[PDB]
Design a binder for this molecule. Structure first.
Ligand SMILES: *CC(=O)N1CCN(Cc2ccc(Br)s2)CC1
Ligand SMILES: *CC(=O)N1CCN(Cc2ccc(Br)s2)CC1
Lengths: 304, 304
């Protein structure tokens, strides 16, 4: 029993973290096979970051300008290229610790683990979600850029995030491993405001199921609702509209607890309308939305 | 910016996890040098667990009865002994992935990372605290026993916890790596009630400092208090008494933010007396008490 915000074990990703230095900017890179992936703003002077022309800035850089260090050993750079907002540095040595891996672009509402790194050294690991506004709520200081987000399916690491920037509101923007930003964000120091941070309804419902499975039940009521009725309440409280797709995904949690999805929706509706009246759910005083239905099943069934 | 509940990177501990089977009970073991550490209840039949005599049960076990598997490779057991509530299985091979390590017994209020494992395979990593009642609030299903808690100081893993049992109230009890239980708990299926789960005051204050450092400031007020006055409020709300020792430990966070510890105490006093009036602090609607002053400094300064 017990339900915790849980990150994937980070060992497989720890083995991929390196330090990348171009001029006097040091950040993190991801070493997979004979390629090191890092944010392209590694080539910038803070001066450059107001309106950088990355193609023009990169022309001034040679393979020998990219200093790549895996622990205390230097990697020899034999090629470099820009793909969207990331640099691919070809090195002469395949990373012997390369796990089985994929590059995936996640949808908003999907969760992943971040391995926060500084100078190619891991500091810690925490669980995040791609917000509906395409930001993440991370923990990233200067030097953390090039830290990556990932999911693990048994033996295969799916990399989904590379950290690139902090908005003035203290939230985080980055790319997939093809260097495409999540949302409308650019690697430029400019006016970039996040949109509405809407709540991930399907995740809150997943987490209500997790609560019931672990003995927190005070919020179950005698009520039911419809998708259309519930969605009127979701609109009012800046919750994502719930779809039949979301209901279908909650099917297994429904089946295990014997609580119909629309009944749990009615519980969530009362919680939205009435708040928690100073009570808690799985040690939280707000509705948690960074567990997916897949996350709740995984943790509740002890998958490795 | 941003502040997250952050676990240590788990790679160094992943390399130490094995599976231990005695008869038909499988749980996790910790392989360090040529010793595998595991809970002694691995020798029990669920029958035994009502009133087990571990010394008598162990006499029926031989080295060849302890099946120890590191991934898909079996370790040869050449010795076994009981130390308090753990078994030490001597194997013929030193773990080549043994990190630099220590065994430490933590005090209540200290935080650590758990690597949840099943059948010697890591499922995930989360951050815990030794509660003042000597329980932890974990995520542990059947098969998770022998999962370990740890801290990392640069290169040295300090193991502080091995998981042994769940109380009927859904909270967790275990041992240090010398096999001594935290608190009064025994490895017997009996009437074991946790005492008062008091709040770790010094940690809440550490986390209020972390909030100020990351721009959450609405809860700063015009007030101050004294240790004795604050402690009257802590008593009323089942908070640990704050000592000069705690004030001294908060010294660096005080110095960095320029908010005197007793002023932050007065903020905490108003929060206790008035609640958060539907507001949040670092994305929480309750007062977080599982960050130490050391944790806040580490995360706020990017230590690896
Ligand atoms: C995420 C992170 O580490 N940083 C620091 C770098 N910053 C952009 C810059 C790159 C080169 C220089 Br000089 S400034 C983004 C945030
Ligand atoms: C923490 C954990 O995995 N478990 C399962 C084992 N249980 C005690 C027992 C050991 C042998 C048998 Br059969 S039952 C404690 C909780």
């Amino acid at each position: 029993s017990g339900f915790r915000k849980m990150a994937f074990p980070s060992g497989k990703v720890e083995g991929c973290m390196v330090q990348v230095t171009c001029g006097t900017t040091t950040l993190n890179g991801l070493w997979l096979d004979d390629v090191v992936y890092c944010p392209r703003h590694v080539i910038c002077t803070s001066e450059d970051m107001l309106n950088p022309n990355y193609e023009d800035l990169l022309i001034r850089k040679s393979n020998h300008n990219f200093l790549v260090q895996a622990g205390n050993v230097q990697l020899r750079v034999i090629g470099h290229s820009m793909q969207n907002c990331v640099l691919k540095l070809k090195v002469d040595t395949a990373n012997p610790k390369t796990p089985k891996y994929k590059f995936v672009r996640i949808q908003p509402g999907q969760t992943f683990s971040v391995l926060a790194c500084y100078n190619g050294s891991p500091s810690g690991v925490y669980q995040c979600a791609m917000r509906p506004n395409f930001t993440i709520k991370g923990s990233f200081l200067n030097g953390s850029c090039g830290s990556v987000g990932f999911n693990i399916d048994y033996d295969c690491v799916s990399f989904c995030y590379m950290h690139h920037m902090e908005l003035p509101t203290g939230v985080h923007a980055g790319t997939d491993l093809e260097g495409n930003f999540y949302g409308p964000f650019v690697d430029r120091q400019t006016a970039q405001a996040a949109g509405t941070d809407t709540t991930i309804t399907v995740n809150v419902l997943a987490w209500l199921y997790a609560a019931v499975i672990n003995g927190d039940r005070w919020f179950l009521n005698r009520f039911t609702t419809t998708l259309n009725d519930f969605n009127l309440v979701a609109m009012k409280y800046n919750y994502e509209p719930l779809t039949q797709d979301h209901v279908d995904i909650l099917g297994p949690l429904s089946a295990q607890t014997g609580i119909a999805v629309l009944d749990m929706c009615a519980s969530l509706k009362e919680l939205l309308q009435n708040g928690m009246n100073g009570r808690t759910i799985l040690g939280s005083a707000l509705l948690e939305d960074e567990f997916t239905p897949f996350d709740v099943v995984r943790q509740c069934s002890g998958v490795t």
